[PDB]
Amino acid sequence: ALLSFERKYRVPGGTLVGGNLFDFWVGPFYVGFFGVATFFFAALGIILIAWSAVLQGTWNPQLISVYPPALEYGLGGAPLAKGGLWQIITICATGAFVSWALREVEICRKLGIGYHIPFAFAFAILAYLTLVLFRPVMMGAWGYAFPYGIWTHLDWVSNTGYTYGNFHYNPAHMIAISFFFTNALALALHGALVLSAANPEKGKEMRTPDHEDTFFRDLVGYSIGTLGIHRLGLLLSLSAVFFSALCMIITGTIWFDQWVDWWQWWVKLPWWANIPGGING
Amino acid sequence: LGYTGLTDEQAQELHSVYMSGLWLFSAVAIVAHLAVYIWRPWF
Amino acid sequence: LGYTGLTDEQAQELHSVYMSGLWLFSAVAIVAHLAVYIWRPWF
Amino acid sequence: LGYTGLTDEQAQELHSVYMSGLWLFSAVAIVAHLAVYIWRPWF
Amino acid sequence: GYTGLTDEQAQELHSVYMSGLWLFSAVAIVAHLAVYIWRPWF
Amino acid sequence: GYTGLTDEQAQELHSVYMSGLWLFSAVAIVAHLAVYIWRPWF
Amino acid sequence: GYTGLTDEQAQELHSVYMSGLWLFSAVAIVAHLAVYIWRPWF
Amino acid sequence: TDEQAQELHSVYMSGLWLFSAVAIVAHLAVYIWRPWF
Amino acid sequence: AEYQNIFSQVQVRGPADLGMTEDVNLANRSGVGPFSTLLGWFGNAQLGPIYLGSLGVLSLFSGLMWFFTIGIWFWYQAGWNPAVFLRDLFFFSLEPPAPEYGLSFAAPLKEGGLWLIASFFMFVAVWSWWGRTYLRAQALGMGKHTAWAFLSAIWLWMVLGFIRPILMGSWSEAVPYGIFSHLDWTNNFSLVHGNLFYNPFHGLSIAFLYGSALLFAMHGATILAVSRFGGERELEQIADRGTAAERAALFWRWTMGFNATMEGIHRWAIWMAVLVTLTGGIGILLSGTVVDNWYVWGQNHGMAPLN
Amino acid sequence: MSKFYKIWMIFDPRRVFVAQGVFLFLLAVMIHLILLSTPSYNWLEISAAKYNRVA
Amino acid sequence: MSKFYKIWMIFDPRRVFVAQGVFLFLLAVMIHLILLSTPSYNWLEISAAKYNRVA
Amino acid sequence: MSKFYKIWMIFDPRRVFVAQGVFLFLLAVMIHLILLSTPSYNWLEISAAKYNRVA
Amino acid sequence: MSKFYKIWMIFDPRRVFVAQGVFLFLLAVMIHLILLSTPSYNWLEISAAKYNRVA
Amino acid sequence: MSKFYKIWMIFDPRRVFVAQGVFLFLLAVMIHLILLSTPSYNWLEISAAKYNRVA
Amino acid sequence: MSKFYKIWMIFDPRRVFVAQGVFLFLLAVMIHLILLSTPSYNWLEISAAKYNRVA
Amino acid sequence: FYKIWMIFDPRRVFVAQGVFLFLLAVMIHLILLSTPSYNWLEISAAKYNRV
Amino acid sequence: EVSEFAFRLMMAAVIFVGVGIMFAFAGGHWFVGLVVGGLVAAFFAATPN
Ligand code: BCL
Ligand code: BCL
Ligand SMILES: CC[C@H]1c2cc3[nH]c4c(c3C)C(=O)[C@H](C(=O)OC)c4c3nc(cc4[nH]c(cc(n2)[C@@H]1C)c(C(C)=O)c4C)[C@@H](C)[C@@H]3CCC(=O)OC/C=C(\C)CCC[C@H](C)CCC[C@H](C)CCCC(C)C
Ligand SMILES: CC[C@H]1c2cc3[nH]c4c(c3C)C(=O)[C@H](C(=O)OC)c4c3nc(cc4[nH]c(cc(n2)[C@@H]1C)c(C(C)=O)c4C)[C@@H](C)[C@@H]3CCC(=O)OC/C=C(\C)CCC[C@H](C)CCC[C@H](C)CCCC(C)C
Ligand SMILES: COC1=C(OC)C(=O)C(C/C=C(\C)CC/C=C(\C)CC/C=C(\C)CC/C=C(\C)CC/C=C(\C)CC/C=C(\C)CC/C=C(\C)CC/C=C(\C)CC/C=C(\C)CCC=C(C)C)=C(C)C1=O
Ligand SMILES: CCCCCCCCCCCCCCCC(=O)OC[C@H](CO[C@H]1O[C@H](CS(=O)(=O)O)[C@@H](O)[C@H](O)[C@H]1O)OC(=O)CCCCCCCCCCCCCCC
Ligand SMILES: COC(C)(C)CCC/C(C)=C/C=C/C(C)=C/C=C/C(C)=C/C=C/C=C(C)/C=C/C=C(\C)CC/C=C(\C)CCC=C(C)C
Ligand SMILES: COC(C)(C)CCC/C(C)=C/C=C/C(C)=C/C=C/C(C)=C/C=C/C=C(C)/C=C/C=C(\C)CC/C=C(\C)CCC=C(C)C
Ligand SMILES: COC(C)(C)CCC/C(C)=C/C=C/C(C)=C/C=C/C(C)=C/C=C/C=C(C)/C=C/C=C(\C)CC/C=C(\C)CCC=C(C)C
Ligand SMILES: COC(C)(C)CCC/C(C)=C/C=C/C(C)=C/C=C/C(C)=C/C=C/C=C(C)/C=C/C=C(\C)CC/C=C(\C)CCC=C(C)C
Ligand SMILES: COC(C)(C)CCC/C(C)=C/C=C/C(C)=C/C=C/C(C)=C/C=C/C=C(C)/C=C/C=C(\C)CC/C=C(\C)CCC=C(C)C
Ligand SMILES: COC(C)(C)CCC/C(C)=C/C=C/C(C)=C/C=C/C(C)=C/C=C\C=C(C)\C=C\C=C(/C)CC/C=C(\C)CCC=C(C)C
Ligand SMILES: [Fe+3]
């Protein structure tokens, strides 16, 4: 079934691979070459998770957990029951996520819109591949990757973090957090401001973007504008994920100690290292 | 003459009521303070 | 006649009541300080 | 005139009220300093 | 000149500014004397 | 001329700038002599 | 040319710049000699 | 222009040669001062 | 490569723009500030004007006094030394009262009295900023969505500094004012309560915090992708749906099988962000008051393996 | 003092009554909070000893 | 001093009364909190000792 | 000196008076807090020892 | 030395006056803080010894 | 030497005098801080020894 | 070597003179900092021994 | 090879050459200073018994 | 084709490394490099033709 305006857009073409072989829809969903690829990897990865639950011997979905190979397996293959399923599901996850981005590129072409959405999604893929692929390969073992399990992947976050003391002291982790909090602030404000104009006080006319500019200037003396706010929300989200990936690729590869000890480089700058008093004197 | 657009007489009416509300409030306030002082002095 | 649009007379009217309020507030504060000093000198 | 829009006549009177505030404030500050000094010299 | 001031205005302005600076400098000079008498740094 | 200063404006303005430079650099030399008299580095 | 300078302006500006380079380098040469008298680095 | 590139290339080359000469002195001088072969 | 509309190619500057009047008390609005050419590459160039008024002055003065009270404590902890102040800037901390003082206001100024004084100025500054955010919308006849969204953040902040300390019975439970010390507090809080990852409302709060980065990335990329159709002019797309809004809707419908509208995506946006601190505040309010070990609570509720 | 009423041509009663209503409530709650936080004045806890309802 | 009334010719009277009200409130609370934070002047803890209340 | 009043042709005195007020108050508050931090000048402690108000 | 006044034809006195005002304050405060942190020049700790207030 | 004044036909003295003001101030700050860092030249620490002012 | 004046037809003199000014400052400061970094040429510590200023 | 001044704007070419050639020359001096055998400042300290 | 701003950024990232190594060596600490190399290179980057 179609949206009432949809029909005029369902034209042929824009496909990157396969021409018209897969240029059709299935309900609302566009298929295409990479939609076939996407569904295969998604279904295989999901089904191998359910099979891993059988091998693990639980059906509670919150206890199901697919662990990577132990560190003794290095970057080589492991037995399926003992890390090899995780490796195949990681291939399927990568295949599904990449196919999904490429399917979005095809939909962008058919609608004639910019490629910003699949490009933004590629940042999430690179953060995933940092944690499951690039950093484990740098550190030399698949066992430094996180396990696929709702709560057990939080054990990996905890155990990885506390290996370096309080992980709040990672300076790139601090920058990533600052973008994450600022993004959530901006999304609250942007949602509220647009809604407050479209949904004014009862009986009043819809407000204009002039009122939107006016409210924020009255509130804080500045207004980024309709175009600026969507640039900002995109770049804040992408910066958060860039500095997140950066904070981990350095952790356990060029920095090994307690992250709190890094900040002594500032304290021990020689023009003030020895000056008595304060906290460090 | 003024910012609010009250008249000078509307100001006097409202003020006479406001002050009476204040005096009724503070009258109870004194009785409460004196009662607590008699019960348990703080000085 | 000034920035505010108040006249030279309106500015004297309001100042007379402002000082009436200031002197009352400070008179009560002076009494409060003297009571506390008699209770517990800080010098 | 200048950059604000005050005249010479306006500015020269305003300044006299400003300086009346300055010296009054400063005079009390002198009394405060001397009283504290007589009580507890800091040199 | 890129302040728009006439020369007459700039001469007037400078006379007030420098008289302020002479007053400020005078207090500073006395203050350094008093502190040097109280506690020399040389 | 990038700044629009006429040749006479540039020949004027430079003369006042130099006057300040010589005044400033002179005071600096007096300061260096005094501190050398206090504590020679060379 | 990219700057629009005449041959006059390009040769004039260069002659002033070269007098800057010579004056700066001449004092630098003297500054080296002054230190070389005190402490040769070879 | 094609003629301007002839002119500039000559000027740049003449300077590029003039810089080379000073290094051709300076390595000899430092070879004299403390030989490195 | 083509133009991506991430930075502007040409800036135009008109006159200064004074903004809508409605019922704004225009005596309380300042002059317009200077233009910034740097900001103009990414958004608007104009700074100002700003509206002050009564809750403005109250909020700005109390907020100044909060900031000044912390600053003087840091200058004291530095021993007035301007070098030590810059060396140890992130190590200074105005700590709350010690536990033996409970909720009593009797703690010495160096042992927690200045933290109560600082916290009082913060309380007045933040709450008066909330009323300011409500009244600036009222003066323009706008909906109060921004004030009700800000109330969700105040809820977490009130739980951290006020409500949970009262329910726990000491100001020692509150957050210290300091860069590294509020981080040490955050880490210590999780250790004392037995791994906060196993708090389900901390789990939810993270889901909405990740979802806010997910959703603003999706929405920001969507609007830039359709900006070639004037899709950033979202209110006119709400009033008079253009091809921008339809192409945006069909991208997501064809991608994931369902879609928003131009008005309705901003409801997803506000709730995704609001739920971060709403569920967060609940998760902290439960910590220590109802659950003292979240990992063991997780074991009893089927989310961690039993021993 | 007889012209203290002149304030109502300056300030709107709707603004003043709300602002004062919020102020007085928070001041009252602040003081009851301060006293309940003080063991010498917690009236519920005083009663627990006076009537030996404790233990 | 006779012309201090010209303050009202340059400053809006509402902004002055608000700004001065705000100031006096914050100052008064700050001093009471300084005295509560001072062991020798906390009137509640003083009277608690004076009358052998729990303190 | 006699021309100092021409400063009010250069600066809007509303902005100067606001800026000056907060400057003076912050400066004074800082000096009092410096002296309270200074044990030899904390008047609240000096009187406490003079009158044996602790122990 | 006579022609210096033409500097006011170049810079707006408002900007220069504010800039030098902030400069002088931040410089003066910095120096007093260097002295208060210097034990040989902290006048508060000097007079405390000179009058035996340290006890 | 005669033509160096043509620098003012190239650089607008407003930008030059600001940049020069920053440059010269920060250079002076460098040198004084290097001297305060230097035991043989820290004038406050020298004066302390010369007048026995420490311990 | 005569035609070196042609540089000013290609490079704007402002944007060269700025580049030269920054370059010369950086080169000079780098050398002075290297000299202070060697005791062989640290003119402060040479002087400290010569005049026996730390003993 | 004079075509190259048509192929690339000589403004860019000299910006490249001038900075790169300086940073190469600097790099060469700074590595030599890190050696024991050719640091001229610290060799001269030995010759004249300065340290 | 490389834009003037692109060429500027490409070249600024060189000055950053170069001035950084210069002053880290001269100032004796890598932070002096990072500060001076940051200021000089950012000044260069900000001012394209
Ligand atoms: C043991 C080691 C030896 C020694 C061995 C050598 C040897 C061997 C050589 C040098 C060379 C040089 N050494 Mg060494 N050197 C020693 C110690 C020093 C000391 C010191 C503090 O002790 C210094 C300052 C120098 C300095 C110098 C330079 C004069 C020269 C490299 C210039 C260069 O490449 O510029 C950078 C080059 C460029 C092309 C870029 C120019 C500048 C750019 C463009 C920046 C902007 C300029 C500005 C905008 C002006 C524009 C002009 C326009 C036309 C208008 N040496 C010791 C004693 N030295 C080399 C030489 O002679 O080179 C010719 C060389 O081969
Ligand atoms: C060792 C550390 C612990 C831990 C301990 C805690 C604790 C403790 C808390 C959180 C909380 C949060 N944690 Mg956790 N957390 C850990 C691991 C994580 C990980 C991870 C990948 O491992 C992530 C993504 C998170 C994520 C998050 C957020 C979802 C949540 C904060 C939401 C928010 O918006 O706060 C930021 C927003 C605010 C604080 C609101 C501020 C609003 C006020 C009004 C602003 C006033 C401004 C002031 C006046 C200044 C004005 C300046 C202007 C210029 C004028 N945690 C581990 C397990 N986490 C919080 C929570 O809600 O928990 C359920 C919380 O309290
Ligand atoms: C880069 C900025 C943020 C971002 C952006 C972003 N994400 C995006 C997009 C964009 C712009 C999309 O276009 C795309 C989309 O379609 O959104 C609806 C997407 C998307 N972001 C998603 C989720 C997501 N994004 C996240 C984060 C972020 N996304 C960043 C913060 C997170 C977390 C944890 O932070 C999650 C969970 C999806 C809704 C969607 C991508 C959907 C997709 O890939 O579909 C194809 C695959 C499947 C349907 C299923 C695959 C199944 C696997 C083969 C098996 C499971 C393996 C997995 C590793 C198990 C993990 C277990 C966990 C308990 C650990
Ligand atoms: C829903 C959850 C998210 C949320 C929402 C949110 N926050 C909000 C809002 C919303 C919807 C607002 O409407 C409100 C706002 O106004 O935003 C612009 C706000 C806000 N969120 C803020 C911060 C913030 N939000 C955060 C987080 C969140 N905000 C969540 C992610 C965080 C963190 C740590 O994650 C922070 C730090 C503020 C920007 C603002 C609230 C401002 C406020 O209350 O300020 C009080 C203080 C002052 C008014 C002044 C302080 C002192 C200044 C230096 C002024 C000094 C002036 C003085 C006159 C100077 C004199 C000097 C003399 C020497 C001369
Ligand atoms: C300005 O405004 C904008 C809007 O709008 C105008 C918006 O909307 C939005 C969008 C945002 C919202 C609506 C807000 C809500 C969204 C979020 C908060 C983000 C989170 C979103 C989700 C959690 C949803 C994610 C959904 C996913 C991942 C997809 C789930 C579905 C599948 C797994 C199926 C996908 C289908 C595919 C790939 C093709 C299927 C078909 C084939 C592979 C072909 C084979 C099948 C056939 C040939 C025939 C049919 C056979 C079938 C069906 C079965 C057998 C098939 C086999 C292969 C065996 C934004 C941003 C916006 O900016
Ligand atoms: C006509 C074509 C002709 C081709 C000729 C043949 C070419 C074969 C060589 C290929 C060269 C490149 C191989 C990679 C680098 C290398 O040498 O690695 C060799 C190491 C072995 O290291 C071992 O040694 C490591 C040390 S070391 O590197 O030797 O020093 C050690 O750290 C590690 O533990 C140990 O296992 O192994 C790897 O790095 C693993 C490769 C993994 C590829 C599959 C991934 C599947 C797991 C899940 C992740 C899925 C990701 C999906 C992404 C889409
Ligand atoms: C840490 O430092 C310490 C705290 C220890 C020391 C700090 C020292 C310091 C810097 C103190 C500064 C003090 C100053 C500057 C005090 C100034 C006080 C003044 C000017 C007070 C004036 C008060 C006036 C009042 C209260 C009254 C005015 C009344 C008027 C105008 C009449 C109209 C009003 C009404 C009819 C009232 C209507 C009712 C309500 C509820 C508004
Ligand atoms: C402990 O010490 C430290 C470590 C903190 C070191 C501190 C050292 C330091 C740097 C101190 C610096 C102090 C300075 C710079 C103080 C300066 C104070 C000044 C400038 C005070 C000025 C006061 C002026 C006053 C009080 C003026 C009041 C004017 C009034 C009330 C009237 C205003 C005028 C009118 C109403 C105009 C009416 C007329 C018309 C026509 C409208
Ligand atoms: C430890 O060793 C170190 C690391 C510190 C070694 C550092 C080595 C090093 C690189 C030092 C560099 C020092 C330099 C380059 C110093 C340069 C100083 C200069 C050029 C100073 C110039 C001062 C100029 C002054 C004070 C001029 C004042 C002008 C005045 C007052 C007049 C203003 C008025 C007018 C121009 C009138 C306007 C005219 C019209 C027509 C409107
Ligand atoms: C081991 O230690 C090190 C690493 C430092 C070893 C050495 C490393 C090394 C590779 C050093 C290289 C040093 C170099 C490349 C030095 C180059 C110095 C230069 C380029 C000096 C140039 C000086 C030029 C001056 C001062 C020019 C001044 C010009 C002036 C004052 C006038 C400008 C013209 C006008 C105002 C006229 C305007 C005309 C019109 C028509 C408006
Ligand atoms: C912390 O310090 C170390 C230990 C590191 C040592 C090194 C510190 C160091 C490098 C210090 C350097 C200090 C310097 C550069 C000080 C410079 C001070 C200056 C520029 C002071 C100037 C003061 C000027 C004053 C006070 C002028 C006042 C003018 C007034 C009052 C009148 C203004 C004019 C009018 C109202 C114009 C009226 C006329 C018309 C036509 C409207
Ligand atoms: C340059 O030097 C100057 C002195 C001029 C300025 C120095 C400025 C400076 C260095 C400021 C430093 C500020 C810092 C580092 C602030 C850090 C703040 C942080 C990280 C705060 C984090 C969390 C705070 C929270 C959660 C606070 C919540 C507070 C609440 C909910 C208020 C509750 C109220 C009370 C407990 C008070 C109750 C009192 C009464 C009277 C009822
Ligand atoms: Fe939007």
Coordinates of C-alpha atoms and ligand atoms in Angstrom, one line a residue, chain G residues 14 17 32 41-42, chain H residues 16 18-31 33-34 36, chain O residues 4 7-8 11 15-21 23-24 27 31 34-35, chain P residues 14-15 17-26 28-29 32-33 38-41 43, ligand 1:
Chain G
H14 CA 61.9 45.9 -3.3
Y17 CA 62.7 45.8 1.7
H32 CA 77.2 37.6 16.4
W41 CA 81.2 28.4 19.5
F42 CA 83.9 26.6 17.5
Chain H
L16 CA 67.9 28.3 -7.1
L18 CA 72.5 31.1 -6.0
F19 CA 71.2 29.1 -3.0
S20 CA 73.1 26.0 -4.2
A21 CA 76.4 27.9 -4.3
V22 CA 76.1 28.8 -0.6
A23 CA 75.6 25.1 0.4
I24 CA 78.5 24.1 -1.9
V25 CA 80.6 26.5 0.2
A26 CA 79.0 25.4 3.5
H27 CA 79.6 21.6 3.2
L28 CA 83.2 22.2 2.2
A29 CA 83.6 24.6 5.2
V30 CA 82.2 22.0 7.6
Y31 CA 84.3 19.3 6.0
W33 CA 86.0 22.2 10.2
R34 CA 85.4 18.5 11.1
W36 CA 82.7 13.4 8.2
Chain O
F4 CA 64.0 39.5 -7.9
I7 CA 58.2 38.7 -6.5
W8 CA 56.1 41.7 -5.5
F11 CA 52.9 37.8 -3.9
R15 CA 50.8 38.7 3.1
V16 CA 54.5 38.3 2.7
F17 CA 55.5 40.9 5.4
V18 CA 53.2 39.1 7.9
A19 CA 54.8 35.8 7.0
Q20 CA 58.3 37.2 7.4
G21 CA 57.5 38.9 10.7
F23 CA 59.0 33.7 10.8
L24 CA 61.8 35.9 12.1
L27 CA 63.6 31.7 14.5
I31 CA 67.7 30.0 19.0
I34 CA 68.1 26.5 22.5
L35 CA 71.0 28.6 24.0
Chain P
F14 CA 56.6 29.0 -3.4
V15 CA 54.5 28.5 -0.3
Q17 CA 59.0 25.2 -1.4
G18 CA 59.8 27.9 1.1
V19 CA 58.3 26.1 4.1
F20 CA 59.4 22.6 3.2
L21 CA 63.0 23.5 2.4
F22 CA 63.2 25.4 5.7
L23 CA 61.7 22.4 7.7
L24 CA 64.1 20.1 6.0
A25 CA 67.1 22.3 6.9
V26 CA 65.8 22.7 10.4
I28 CA 68.9 18.3 9.6
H29 CA 70.3 20.8 12.2
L32 CA 72.8 16.8 14.3
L33 CA 72.3 18.6 17.7
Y38 CA 78.6 17.0 15.9
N39 CA 76.7 19.1 18.4
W40 CA 78.8 22.3 18.0
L41 CA 77.6 24.0 21.1
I43 CA 81.7 20.2 21.5
Ligands
BCL1 C1 77.7 21.3 12.8 C2 76.6 22.1 12.0 C3 77.1 23.5 11.6 C4 76.3 24.0 10.4 C5 76.3 23.4 9.2 C6 75.5 23.8 8.0 C7 75.6 23.3 6.7 C8 76.5 22.2 6.3 C9 74.7 24.0 6.0 C10 74.1 24.9 6.9 C11 73.1 25.7 6.3 C12 72.5 26.8 6.9 N1 72.6 26.9 8.3 MG1 73.6 25.7 9.7 N2 75.3 24.9 10.9 C13 75.7 25.3 12.1 C14 74.9 26.2 12.8 C15 73.9 27.1 12.4 C16 73.1 28.1 13.3 C17 73.3 28.2 14.7 C18 72.3 28.9 15.6 O1 74.3 27.7 15.3 C19 72.3 28.8 12.4 C20 71.3 29.9 12.6 C21 72.5 28.2 11.1 C22 71.8 28.6 9.9 C23 72.0 28.2 8.6 C24 71.4 28.8 7.4 C25 72.0 30.2 7.1 C26 71.5 27.8 6.3 C27 70.2 27.1 5.9 C28 69.2 28.1 5.3 C29 67.9 27.4 4.8 O2 67.9 26.3 4.4 O3 66.9 28.2 4.8 C30 65.6 27.7 4.4 C31 65.6 27.7 2.9 C32 64.7 28.2 2.1 C33 64.8 28.2 0.5 C34 63.5 28.9 2.6 C35 63.6 30.4 2.8 C36 62.7 31.1 3.8 C37 61.2 30.8 3.7 C38 60.7 31.2 2.3 C39 60.4 31.5 4.8 C40 59.8 32.9 4.5 C41 60.8 34.0 4.2 C42 60.2 35.5 4.1 C43 58.7 35.5 3.8 C44 61.0 36.2 3.1 C45 60.6 36.0 1.6 C46 61.6 36.5 0.5 C47 60.9 37.0 -0.8 C48 61.9 36.9 -1.9 C49 60.3 38.4 -0.7 N3 73.5 27.2 11.1 C50 76.8 24.6 12.7 C51 78.0 25.4 13.0 N4 74.6 24.8 8.1 C52 72.9 25.2 4.9 C53 73.2 26.2 3.8 O4 74.2 26.7 3.6 O5 72.1 26.3 3.0 C54 72.3 27.3 1.9 C55 74.0 24.0 4.8 O6 74.0 23.3 3.8

